[PDB]
Write a protein that binds this ligand. Structure first.
Ligand SMILES: Nc1ncnc2c1ncn2[C@@H]1O[C@H](COP(=O)(O)OP(=O)(O)OP(=O)(O)O)[C@@H](O)[C@H]1O
Ligand SMILES: Nc1ncnc2c1ncn2[C@@H]1O[C@H](COP(=O)(O)OP(=O)(O)OP(=O)(O)O)[C@@H](O)[C@H]1O
Ligand SMILES: [Zn+2]
Ligand SMILES: [Zn+2]
Lengths: 76, 139, 468, 139, 69, 76
């Protein structure tokens, strides 16, 4: 289904996910086209930090729903 | 407001004066294909108390035209020739709205014959009115 | 057509000035002859008695209504309140139908007498807080260069001036500009594209761009003295280059009026400048431009001169016919009549003054925008206060990670903070419109709890905590 | 506007004025070669209603000219003394795009005699016209 | 007053008469007393040269109206 | 060789600088085109202020990269 993956810098990129798929397929999709390892791939929905070992049925992710991605930036 | 039935006794002069106001405004097509131009000035004169200003207001409200009023002793200035600028101001304001009708009562008070004065500003006031009416090419 | 809510209230009130009985009155107590009759609000003799130098245009509208509407028939409703035109009518209503071949006196623009305007649109500009414009001067204290801004505010009645409108300002927005030590000049295209989106958020908040400010300080020695004194009586009041920027801003923002034939007349726009007093401080002053002559000739004939007091008049190239400009000045022996057959005519004559001021701190009706006035502004890239989301952890943070609603709502009513949030457009536009209306209006306690219970504000504090 | 051959009866005065104001306007030659400067002023007079304002607009239209029109009573009606600047800009703008024709209509309302003088602005516009008329000797 | 409002420079007399009828309409019932109207309204004779206008004609257009009970 | 210096008003200034010179020569080249003294000038390279005593190689500034120009007086 169609979703709106939006990072912290306002860049929204359209991705694809199944309604019963896990969130690790989304984390693997960010690892493909953005090259981010999963220690910095932080998705947030409904004010809660989405764990990497869960599915979309717990957070009730529906079609055409936006996503809030946080990327870690550090000097050390 | 008054109307056409508001005054009687001058029924011959009422039907005569109604031709020169309705035909240039209601049906102007009679002046086409005949060559001539419709006239502008109508001159009424008589003793006071006959209803000159009453007949002017009766023909204005019965047609719905843009009526205007120019008074005799009002617009007559001595400052810098302001009477010559206020006469042409009233003509361009009447030209901006179609159809329109102006009325100048006690016209003998504004620039009379020069048998007495002959040197004042009223000699140049009437000549302003000559070129203002002759420059009315708006049919 | 519909005018403003402030403009219709000044029209309904007559604003008459009452007088008392006198020794010169010979009539009875139940009457008035001439000496205790009600005074008209447009008489300039009463104005200069109380040192009011202009006749408060809504009363000037009344003094022309007496000339338009009379006791006679009339039947016109002309209401001659229009902009006097200096452009040339091409049709000309005569036999000189092209201007390349023919021009007569009824279409020729007359020689400009240079008579000063006796009425001003805005009568008194007022402010909201001394901490608001203190941040504007603080921008100069960090980068050492001049600044620029636009003032957003509203209007209301003024009871000091008879039938007068006062100008209230609420917040100041700064466009992105390139600063310079001598002056400043920015691109008008990127400013107009930036000002289009600020006018969107100003509609729901009840704001309107009605003013602008630009600085001119020239610090003396940075010790005992504050600034130099550039603008005085012998020098220029307003430079001729800034007359052009003030003239284009008034033509872009017209004021709606039912009395005008074109539908718009007598623009209510203020131009304020920070220049400093004569002796020792940085006191500001404001003047607005004149509508009678300067507002229409700026479309064709205003050219820049090397003198700040004067402006050059250029020549005619086949469509730009200008009349001669005359003014009176004293010669080496006496005072003479109009002399100007020479270019570079002064522009300080075409300015009407205003009275600026700040209200008392003990009481007011409202202030509506005093949150901190210390938040980093949107386009202050010359200064260091142009931060990213690192500032939002420092500024508000939902204070101490658990905030009281009396201490949380007092920070949320900032103008530039609310204009920074909706640019990210995390919240819905329906939830954002009730967010800005809660911060600017009263009885906000029942609607602030509606904001914290929404999932959009929960996602805002969750995406801020993980980021730096 | 009106044409050229729309005037009958005045054929003798037409041939007097066609060689006077039309022929030296379109032909800068045959006057320098003959050594005679052309006249720079004509005066038309007579009874009213004879073709004074009609012949001037007819002779200037279908010849090729600038035709600066200026009316009699419309000048001097200004304030603070700007009728001289409206006269100085009248003659200056005509010679910038020569050939030009300056038709002063109703000149009797501008220049009376010195025994019928009125105020001080009437002397100021008759001496401005006499000075500026002499400035056209540069051909 | 007659010789008081007519001694002005022909510009404030027409506004004083406009202020006279407007104030009497506001606080009706009202009377309007004027004295020495011969100084305001003289006759037209061979000795022309006075102002003789712009004030009595203002009184003509003010008095013929206002009769709406 | 090529470089792009851009101000805050959206105006990019073209300049041809050597790959192995100092930053002070870059501030001198922008002085000649406009007339701004290089004492108050400052150069921002992606949020990092360039020091005038250094060169173009230690900051790893590549060819035709977008630069920033800002004015800030020391005492002012
Ligand atoms: N049909 C009518 N014919 C004559 N008189 C009339 C008629 N109807 C009414 N009247 C009376 O005659 C008077 C009209 O006179 P009017 O007001 O015209 O004075 P006037 O001197 O003619 O005006 P002006 O000052 O313009 O010359 C009214 O007061 C009215 O009572
Ligand atoms: N050959 C002609 N002679 C006189 N009048 C004519 C002739 N042909 C036409 N007319 C009529 O006479 C009018 C032109 O008269 P004109 O405007 O010259 O008045 P004038 O008294 O001669 O001069 P002024 O306009 O200064 O009074 C036109 O409206 C036209 O109908
Ligand atoms: Zn009294
Ligand atoms: Zn014209």
């Amino acid at each position: 289904m169609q979703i709106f993956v939006k990072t912290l810098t306002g860049k929204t990129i359209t991705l694809e996910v199944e309604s019963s798929d896990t969130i690790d397929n989304v984390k693997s999709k960010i690892q493909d086209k953005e090259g981010i390892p999963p220690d910095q791939q932080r998705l947030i929905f409904a004010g809660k930090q989405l764990e990497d070992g869960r599915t979309l049925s717990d957070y009730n992710i529906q079609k055409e729903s936006t996503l809030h991605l946080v990327l870690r930036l550090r000097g050390g | 407001e008054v109307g056409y039935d508001d005054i009687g006794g001058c029924r011959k002069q009422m039907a005569q004066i109604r031709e020169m106001v309705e035909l240039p405004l209601r049906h102007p097509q009679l002046f086409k294909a005949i060559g001539i131009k419709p006239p502008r000035g109508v001159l009424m004169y008589g003793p006071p108390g006959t209803g000159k200003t009453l007949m002017a207001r009766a023909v204005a409200n019965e047609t719905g035209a843009f009526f205007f009023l120019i008074n005799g002793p009002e617009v007559m200035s001595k400052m810098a020739g302001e009477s010559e600028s206020n006469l042409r101001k009233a003509f361009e304001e009447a030209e901006k709205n179609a159809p329109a009708i102006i009325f100048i009562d006690e016209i003998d008070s504004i620039a009379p014959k020069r048998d007495k004065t002959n040197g004042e500003v009223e000699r140049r006031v009437v000549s302003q009115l000559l070129t203002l009416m002759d420059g009315m090419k708006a049919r | 057509i519909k005018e403003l809510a402030v403009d219709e209230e000044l029209e309904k009130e007559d604003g008459l000035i009452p007088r008392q009985k006198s020794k010169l009155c010979k009539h009875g107590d139940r009457g008035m002859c001439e000496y205790c009759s009600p005074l008209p609000p447009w008489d300039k003799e009463y104005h200069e008695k109380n040192k009011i130098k202009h006749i408060s245009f809504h009363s000037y509208l009344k003094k022309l209504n007496e000339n338009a509407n009379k006791k006679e028939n009339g039947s016109s409703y002309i209401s001659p309140l229009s902009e006097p035109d200096f452009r040339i009518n091409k049709r000309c209503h005569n036999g000189h139908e092209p201007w390349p071949r023919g021009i007569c006196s009824k279409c020729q623009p007359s020689a400009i007498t240079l008579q000063q305007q006796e009425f001003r649109m805005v009568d008194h500009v007022e402010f909201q807080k001394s901490e608001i414009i203190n941040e504007f001067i603080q921008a100069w204290r960090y980068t050492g260069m001049q600044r620029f801004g636009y003032m957003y505010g509203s209007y209301s009645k003024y009871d000091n001036t008879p039938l007068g409108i006062k100008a209230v300002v609420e917040a100041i927005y700064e466009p992105p500009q390139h600063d310079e030590q001598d002056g400043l000049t920015m691109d008008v295209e990127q400013v107009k594209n930036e000002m289009l989106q600020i006018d969107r958020q100003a509609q729901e908040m009840g704001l309107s761009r009605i003013g602008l400010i630009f600085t001119d300080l020239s610090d003396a020695g940075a010790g005992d003295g504050s600034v130099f004194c550039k603008r005085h009586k012998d020098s220029f009041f307003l430079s001729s280059l800034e007359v052009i920027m003030a003239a284009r801003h008034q033509t872009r923002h017209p004021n709606v009026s039912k009395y005008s034939e074109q539908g718009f007349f007598s623009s209510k726009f203020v131009t304020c400048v920070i220049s400093g007093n004569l002796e020792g401080e940085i006191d500001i002053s404001s003047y607005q431009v004149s509508t009678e002559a300067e507002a229409l000739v700026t479309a064709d004939m205003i050219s820049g001169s090397t003198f700040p007091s004067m402006a050059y008049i250029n020549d005619t190239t086949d469509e730009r016919y200008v009349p001669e400009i005359f003014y009176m000045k004293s010669n080496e022996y006496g005072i003479t009549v109009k002399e100007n057959a020479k270019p570079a005519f002064p522009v300080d004559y075409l300015l009407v003054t205003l009275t600026h001021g700040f209200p008392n701190t003990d009481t007011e009706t409202n202030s509506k925008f005093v949150s901190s006035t210390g938040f980093p502004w949107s386009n202050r890239q010359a200064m260091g206060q142009s931060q990213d989301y690192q500032e939002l952890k420092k500024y508000l943070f939902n204070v101490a990670s658990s905030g009281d609603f009396n201490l949380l709502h007092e920070k949320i009513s900032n103008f530039h903070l609310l204009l920074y949030i909706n640019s990210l457009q995390i919240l819905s536009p329906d939830e954002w419109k009730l967010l800005i209306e809660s911060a600017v209006k009263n009885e906000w306690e029942e609607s602030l709890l509606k904001l914290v219970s929404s999932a959009g504000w929960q996602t805002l504090v969750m995406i801020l905590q993980e980021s730096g």
